[PDB]
Amino acid sequence: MDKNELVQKAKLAEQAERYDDMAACMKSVTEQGAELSNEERNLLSVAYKNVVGARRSSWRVVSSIEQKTEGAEKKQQMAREYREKIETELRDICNDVLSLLEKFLIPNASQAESKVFYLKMKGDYYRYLAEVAKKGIVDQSQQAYQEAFEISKKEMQPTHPIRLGLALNFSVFYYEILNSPEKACSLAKTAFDEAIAELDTLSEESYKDSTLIMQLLRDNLTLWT
């Protein structure tokens, strides 16, 4: 249909908390080939984060039951198989996102904010694959993030929410995926410290987003230290 119609439907889906519907609307919108607008990009992002999120949460629950049922033959076998079924849906989602990114989003990103958002997203989704894989997925996640990290350090101020959000997820990648808490803490601390050094650059538009991310950064640092 017309993009505004699909966008309308995605927004209705969003209010209905029907995220698979929301993502299918935004996937159709992206497959129309035109660079997404700020609003369109965010809808696609919310949609998919919620769709993959439900499966990551179920996966963690079933994975933790699988560990806890060591010594319980039947329970563990059932847990393992259900984990594998969840894991496939999770990879199918991640793979759908990653192909949207490679085919459409990254290639049409016209401004540095957009390129960083999408390369981050690519690091995120590879990082969600790494959570259930750890395999050369790790390198894809790392390279995406690194490249996003480099562009945001040059093109964005330290308090820009996209740049902070990227710092936050790349620090989580180091911590959880590469098991490098010292690198994770240094990345988060740097980003936090550089942003609080420039609080006068917080804008009306981005204030809440930026400060919420600064606090997540500091809260992570608190936990990792």
Partner: peptide, 8 residues
């Protein structure tokens, strides 16, 4: 997970 990444 006690630590967080960027919320939707």
């Amino acid at each position: 997970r006690l630590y967080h990444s960027l919320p939707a």
